[PDB]
């Protein structure tokens, strides 16, 4: 039915399921705008092919060919699949809009299927390619984090009562390097450009005349070519292709709004504000460095990920409360780190 | 069937499933009024569509052209099946009330999913964007006062045998900003223009004459348009419009009626009320000083999650029956605190 | 529905389900695109077996002979059935492209099945036979490289404050057996050929003119031979011939750019590089030798399949991190090391 | 739908279920080669029932006798189904080729089933009477060289800074007792045997002339007997013979080319080989005597079975790896033991 299908495909988990396994555990692993980007991609499609076959909305099958009266219930069966079959023959049927709109007409929910498959590509691509990578890398970056503070807070503790740059150093690295960057863009541009085709398509499928899907179907080859009982035509019409258009209207209504986010994304240098890693800098143990803005490197894709994924973080979290307080400035930094008593 | 039906959309946690995730445990994150306003207004529209179609109340096709005796069952089909295709061709089908009641009438089931759909789509951006953060912080502040609880008590135990505000100061940085609660206000709001609009389209859809579902419709395009056999046209009506009607104006009535709880929503400060905190003042480790009311502010959206959530602290739900007690004032707020010894 | 089978087939983890045992917890033991290679190769032709009868590409019955109008529908449905039973026959039928389009327009869905069990055989076989004692080498020389590392990072340490290559051993040995890359090559080869081959009959079924679904049928043997009333023969079609074409060249188009990956992987020394053990050098506690590379041995294998599945190893992470760090050279190696504290 | 059938019973568990037990963890209690033959001997024909009458491949009814014109269509399907029934009744029909083909046709289905559970019995026989006791014994003979190897490798760290051969004596004693392995040579050659058995039935059943499908049915018994309107007999055709010859013939043939796999299978003392327990030869605590080959006894079934499911035992694996580096000889046995430290 109509809610089951909307259930199953909007107010459902449908494709918002984390990885399933022990590997990520907590990780997003995809940046929240890209999963809604692909959600909807691939989603919306597939869930206006549900609808358009809903049990309410159709009327029953999808060409009826008006026989004759004289003709018996099996012979109009006949002519009714002949001319859905002959949708591809062209000399069988002669329409005034040509034959690919009766292709497309016939293939529209092939063809919304292949545009959800070609978008939900790249997601897959970068799932099964350069997650893990990025996975096991902020994971590292995170325990570094938790590490760091637990030592700072301990010597703070100690005083009330190696020191190298890991964490920092391998950042810089990750300065130099590119690839994953790379990759994200290439993906995120390979989903625009097909967004955009599929835009066309739509477009195209919606500007017909809306009644290219009559056209007439001619049972003439074969023995019955020189039959005479039989007439020379019929008149055919492809049931469903209004709601095909209004579906189709509307899944380019919804992908010319997505296509602007798709171009925010690739800009991901932008995207890269509000310094995770500044909170950070007030602690003892932790140099007072920055250095990640202003680059088409994977490390102002990193510093998205962080910036997504980082509330998960304890010591994050309290670095960040500490910074708030310091708005007004009234305590100390170090005073309220010990006072915290954060470790775990 | 319909009791199946009732038992997914009312008696079911259809929309009330909390987080499926270890990171928010026993966190709400969405007030009890707007969960029931969004489970309202989602799962109404959808629970009157598959009532609509419903085995019962459904006779069967939805479109039925009374085709003359002479036709047979097949050219009667096409002839249903080419009226219910063309409600969009405005010239095959000639009808008093026009072709925007049709289209209405054959489109209704999809115009109450894209109402449940723009319904639901402030309630996720609201639990994909501004929900981890509150989260986290509320999680933060529960733990704050759990440990402060913890160290008055012990303070007390061994008074009968840093200490700074760092929550107090969270609360009052969090009065500042204010991009929480303007995202709440925006959703609500966006929620409640969705829902008139909404009220708006059922209330001109109830308002039909009713005759509106009966329609005239032509089969004399292509081929058929000068055939002699063929009658000019037929006598269509639209079955189920009565039920789609009905159900429109309960899905009126619910709006309206929901409406003045979204729009008492939109007046957090006001709802701002029963101060949680003050409970905590009695704390010697705890700095008497609310400071939160009379605020446009993040401040009482975070005392209104407080007060809907922290009946899961412990040590609230002991400052809590301390403040019941004292209003015979029989006791003494440390001694009872002393006696209750309520730690973990 | 269409929705339904993509779901099943490209959005959800078919064949991509890990191990379900303990034996295998975490270890892929098989590589990526090998898996992606199967998994498009099995699950496709599977796919477009669905899209061919779904409900509503679909126009109903897969043969219509178009039987007189004084025949019953009964004696239609005879008919019918009676061709598509008698596409075997071939005294039957008299078509002109002959009655193999005919078998293959019949047995189409059995044939793409066919294909998708050949494919799926030589993965079974490697899961099934090569594929434990990849599984149990690999954990020990994962356990065996956790526990070098652990030594070295003990050693350090109490310097602050045996001794054999197993493992160079045993890879040493292993550059010399080769039964796991000769039966890997093996199975790449054969899913190869089986490709080939699909490849060979998608474009033969696609070549056909597309009339050969018609073919001519008579129902004129045994007591029906010499009657008169039935006519000597009869017009029919085979319905979705053009589905099953167009989904033919879909997949020819799919496994045709799939052959040059198969290609690729057949050559597994050249895809034997970035050396997974480089970065195991520097510890002192392990050999400055890795020893692997151009070879049809086994070894190169093993190197894949660590390449692959290492990242699940927190002490090559950590080495992989050091060596990061070591491209700008700031620190040195073994002090990096004693500062990370990453045994376990 | 026939890709559901295929993942049910190719890329499903089917038939390789782990015993769903505490009993049996992590044992196979069934060779692989025996656990495939079972698998496809069973799922093959049972895949074949359910393709022989997929929805897709299926035109509709299994028979159809072609009534006259003036019949109506109860009295067709009263037609048709009598001739169904009747198949049985040798009187009601004449057939060319007999009345056996006609059973076989209408009871194909059943047959391949019978087949199936005859080849399963086999199998369910050996995992209910002969696994459990392999089961015990083989755990009890790990547990034993688990506890073997620990005692040597804690002898020799107790040099560096009881002793009787109860597991070589257990298998001395099996060596005499043959009762599993004529339990298992019974088993396989029963499946052996139905194996053939079902060649012979899908050879002749295939060597049809294939329009034995076609037979004269006559509804004249009783009071129609003497009836004149009804015509004196029918042609009736059974649909899906074609089909059932076609899957018959590709069981035949797989069914040929599994037989020499049982056969095979039935020569366990040529299978014993890669003497297993070889490795463990070189332990201190561990007798030098093997005394596993060349006999029609348990004991070489048990070598199977250890060199089948030993992968598992972690002082296998250990000394296998020893194994493999004696190759070279560059080291020494006892020191590559004692600096392995794999106890557990
Ligand atoms: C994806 C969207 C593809 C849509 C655009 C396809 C480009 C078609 C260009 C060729 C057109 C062509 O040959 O001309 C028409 C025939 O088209 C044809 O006969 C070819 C029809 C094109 C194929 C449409 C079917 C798409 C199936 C998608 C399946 C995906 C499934 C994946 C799981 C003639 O007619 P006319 O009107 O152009 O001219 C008639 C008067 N001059
Ligand atoms: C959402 C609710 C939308 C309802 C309001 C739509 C505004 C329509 C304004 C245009 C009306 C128009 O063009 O005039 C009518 C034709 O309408 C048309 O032909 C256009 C019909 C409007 C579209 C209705 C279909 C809604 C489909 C929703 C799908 C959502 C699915 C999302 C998953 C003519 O006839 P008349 O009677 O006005 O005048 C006849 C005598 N002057
Ligand atoms: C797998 C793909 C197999 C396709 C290629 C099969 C090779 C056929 C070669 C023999 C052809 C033959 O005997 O000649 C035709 C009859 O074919 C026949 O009567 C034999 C038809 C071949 C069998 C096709 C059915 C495949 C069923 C697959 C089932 C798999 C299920 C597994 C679970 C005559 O006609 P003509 O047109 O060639 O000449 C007519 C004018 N000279
Ligand atoms: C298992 C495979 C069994 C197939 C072989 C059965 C042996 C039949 C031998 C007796 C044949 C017989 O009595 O002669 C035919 C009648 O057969 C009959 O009337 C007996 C038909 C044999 C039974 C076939 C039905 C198998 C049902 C399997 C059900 C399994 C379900 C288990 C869950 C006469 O006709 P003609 O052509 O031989 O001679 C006609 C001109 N002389
Ligand atoms: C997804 C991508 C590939 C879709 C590409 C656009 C498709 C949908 C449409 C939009 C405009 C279309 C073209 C418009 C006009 C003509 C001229 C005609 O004489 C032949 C077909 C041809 C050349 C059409 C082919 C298909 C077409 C290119
Ligand atoms: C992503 C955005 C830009 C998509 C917007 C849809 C655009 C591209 C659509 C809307 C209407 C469409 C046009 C409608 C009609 C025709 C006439 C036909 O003979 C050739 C294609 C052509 C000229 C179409 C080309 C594509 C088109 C211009
Ligand atoms: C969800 C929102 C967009 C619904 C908006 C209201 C819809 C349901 C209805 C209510 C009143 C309606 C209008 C009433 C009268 C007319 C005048 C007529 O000559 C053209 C249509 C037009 C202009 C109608 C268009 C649709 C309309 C605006
Ligand atoms: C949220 C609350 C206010 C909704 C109450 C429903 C109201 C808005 C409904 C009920 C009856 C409706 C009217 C019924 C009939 C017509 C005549 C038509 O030619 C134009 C629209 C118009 C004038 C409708 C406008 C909307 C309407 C006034
Ligand atoms: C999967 C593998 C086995 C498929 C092999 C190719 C199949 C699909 C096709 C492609 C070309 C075909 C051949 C083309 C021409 C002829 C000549 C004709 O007089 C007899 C059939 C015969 C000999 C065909 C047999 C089937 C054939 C070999
Ligand atoms: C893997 C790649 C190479 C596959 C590409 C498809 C090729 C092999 C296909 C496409 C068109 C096909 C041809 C189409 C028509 C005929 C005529 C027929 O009488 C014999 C087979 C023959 C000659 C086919 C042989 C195979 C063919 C050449
Ligand atoms: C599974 C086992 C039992 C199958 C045994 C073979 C079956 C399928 C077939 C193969 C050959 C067949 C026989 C061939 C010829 C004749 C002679 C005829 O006048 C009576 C039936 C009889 C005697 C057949 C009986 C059934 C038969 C034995
Ligand atoms: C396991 C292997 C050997 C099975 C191979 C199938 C063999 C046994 C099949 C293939 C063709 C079959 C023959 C086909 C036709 C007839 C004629 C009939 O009047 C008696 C049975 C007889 C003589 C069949 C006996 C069995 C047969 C020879
Ligand atoms: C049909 O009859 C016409 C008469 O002109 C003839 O040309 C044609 O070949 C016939 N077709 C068939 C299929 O017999
Ligand atoms: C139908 O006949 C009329 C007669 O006036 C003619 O004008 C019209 O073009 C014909 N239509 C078709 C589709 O042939
Ligand atoms: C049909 O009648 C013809 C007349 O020539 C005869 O040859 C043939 O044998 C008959 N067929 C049957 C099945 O009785
Ligand atoms: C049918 O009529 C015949 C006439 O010869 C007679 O012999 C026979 O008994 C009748 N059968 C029945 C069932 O009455």
Redesign the interface.
């Known amino acids: ?3 089951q ?3 199953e ?3 459902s ?1 449908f ?1 918002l399921k ?1 990885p ?4 990520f555990k ?1 990780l997003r692993l995809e940046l ?1 705008v890209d999963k ?1 980007v692909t959600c909807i991609a ?1 989603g919306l499609p ?2 206006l ?9 159709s ?9 004759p ?14 001319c ?2 002959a ?3 062209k000399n069988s049927l002669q329409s005034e809009s040509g034959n690919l709109p009766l292709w497309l007409h ?2 529209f ?2 063809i919304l ?1 292949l545009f ?2 070609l978008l ?1 590509l790249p997601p897959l691509f970068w799932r ?2 350069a997650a ?2 990025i996975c ?2 902020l994971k ?1 970056i995170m325990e570094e984090l938790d ?1 760091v503070y637990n030592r700072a807070i301990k010597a703070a503790k100690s005083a009330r009562d ?3 740059p ?1 964490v920092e ?2 950042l ?3 300065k ?1 390097s590119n690839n994953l960057i790379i990759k994200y863009i290439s993906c995120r541009l390979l989903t625009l450009i097909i967004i955009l085709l599929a835009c066309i398509y739509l477009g195209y499928y919606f500007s017909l005349s ?2 290219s ?2 056209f ?1 179907c001619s ?1 003439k ?4 070519r020189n039959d005479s ?1 039989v007439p020379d ?3 055919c ?1 492809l ?4 709601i095909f ?2 579906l189709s209207v509307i899944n380019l209504v919804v992908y010319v709004l997505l296509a602007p986010v798709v171009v925010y994304t690739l800009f991901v240098p932008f995207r890269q504000k509000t310094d995770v890693l500044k909170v950070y800098e007030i602690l003892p143990t932790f140099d007072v460095l920055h250095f990640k803005s202003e680059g088409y490197n994977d490390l102002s894709l990193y510093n998205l990920f962080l910036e997504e994924n980082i ?2 973080v304890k010591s994050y ?2 670095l960040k ?1 500490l910074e ?2 310091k ?2 400035g ?2 100390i930094d170090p ?2 780190l ?4 954060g470790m775990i």
């Open positions: 039915a109509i809610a299908l909307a259930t495909y909007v107010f988990d494709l984390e399933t396994e022990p590997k907590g929240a809604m691939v597939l869930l092919i549900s609808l358009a076959f809903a049990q309410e909305i009327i029953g099958t999808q060409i009826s060919c008006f026989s009266s004289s003709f018996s219930w099996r012979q109009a069966a006949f002519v009714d699949s002949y859905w079959a949708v591809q023959q016939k293939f929910p092939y299927l959800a498959i939900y099964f390619a893990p990578h096991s890398d590292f590490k190696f020191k190298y890991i150093q391998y810089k690295t990750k130099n809306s009644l899907d009559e007439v049972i080859s074969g023995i019955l009982t035509q019929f008149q019409k049931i469903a292709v209004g258009q209004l509330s998960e979290k309290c409360v708030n307080i708005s007004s009234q305590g005073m309220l010990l006072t915290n008593l």
